[PDB]
Symmetry: C2
């Protein structure tokens, strides 16, 4: 079982809560996208607990090897607190956690340890590099990255996630991604929306 | 059915996890304390979940009127995230939450024209509370109460009273705490030697608020 199971349940949860939207949106890069995703709209505890559970399941199923959950400031902090809590209470996995600030670190000591970097999105490699350099100083190694979404689109001729993955030789995983959203669209939505997705991928996908 | 459940009292949980210790501890200020307390040492998920459950219970049992849980950066953020998670997972309560940044200026639920319960670890000085108060006042958000891990019930630096008492007096709001000096002192009387009992009495006489 080398693959993760595509997650239609998560997509329905994102849709119901306005985190994932379909239509026509102008992104910061100026690109006209047929979907928009903003996990920042999850703002009540039941939403956070559910999101955290989706992250926990992915971390468990990936079987990635790490010692400490690392949440970079600012989005990684509440995620790691919530994920650590869910891992313990729902899955009996008691994991150490650590945070940094924008003491440089707090929580479990990461010196000479392998950590799993948890964050919302990775549109550029800047944030990753910020963490990598801070952690290197204390001989801490990033064993992998877990995100809410991987848009799988060019940053450069490749995505910022693919570049990190290749250059650092670690898994960069995500709760959902363009492929999963596109499969949801093909199986549920009308032909015009389906074609918008196809054209978008043809132009910006990778 | 959830894991890491128990009826254990907080002090036992803190002792077991090295968050509370009894002995001789010179604080940064020079005050020599007969106990050590640092909730930061609850640094794994099961510990954070259990700490968050203790806060959750205080919050559930209070009649303070509020709409949203506010976690100021940096220590309030993971606490509110964990507390909100526990409320949903264990108590079936769906609580709105919000955070700020240390440096819009807020994230999470819109606090404009709302009442919030400010969650944090400790409050040793009033400087921090004031920063939140001022920032929230700009959006007409009001702090209805504060919840902390511990109330040391001791004088703030250059003051005759604790930072928490000064906040209760000046802002007319309650300051709730998972544990406090009095509760730790009750455990000391019940379980420890007369010499430690005396160290606590003397500390309270010298610095108590």
């Amino acid at each position: 079982n080398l693959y993760f199971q595509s997650n239609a349940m998560f997509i329905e949860f994102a849709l119901k809560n306005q985190v994932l939207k379909f239509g026509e949106f102008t992104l910061k890069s100026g690109r006209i996208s047929p979907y928009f995703f903003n996990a920042g709209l999850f703002n009540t505890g039941a939403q956070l607990a559910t999101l955290a559970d989706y992250y926990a399941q992915l971390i468990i199923k990936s079987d990635v090897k790490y010692d400490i959950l690392f949440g970079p400031a600012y989005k990684g902090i509440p995620l790691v607190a919530a994920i650590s809590t869910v891992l313990a209470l729902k899955y009996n996995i008691d994991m150490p956690y650590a945070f940094d600030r924008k003491g440089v670190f707090v929580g479990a000591d990461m010196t000479n340890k392998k950590v799993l970097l948890i964050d919302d999105v990775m549109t550029a490699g800047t944030a990753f590099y910020e963490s990598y350099n801070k952690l290197k100083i204390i001989n801490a190694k990033i064993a992998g990255v877990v995100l809410s979404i991987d848009r799988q689109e060019k940053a450069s001729d490749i995505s910022a996630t693919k570049k990190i993955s290749q250059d650092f030789n670690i898994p960069v995983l995500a709760v959902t991604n363009f492929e999963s959203i596109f499969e949801y669209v093909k199986e549920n939505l009308d032909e015009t929306m389906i074609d918008k997705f196809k054209q978008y991928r043809q132009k910006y996908g990778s």
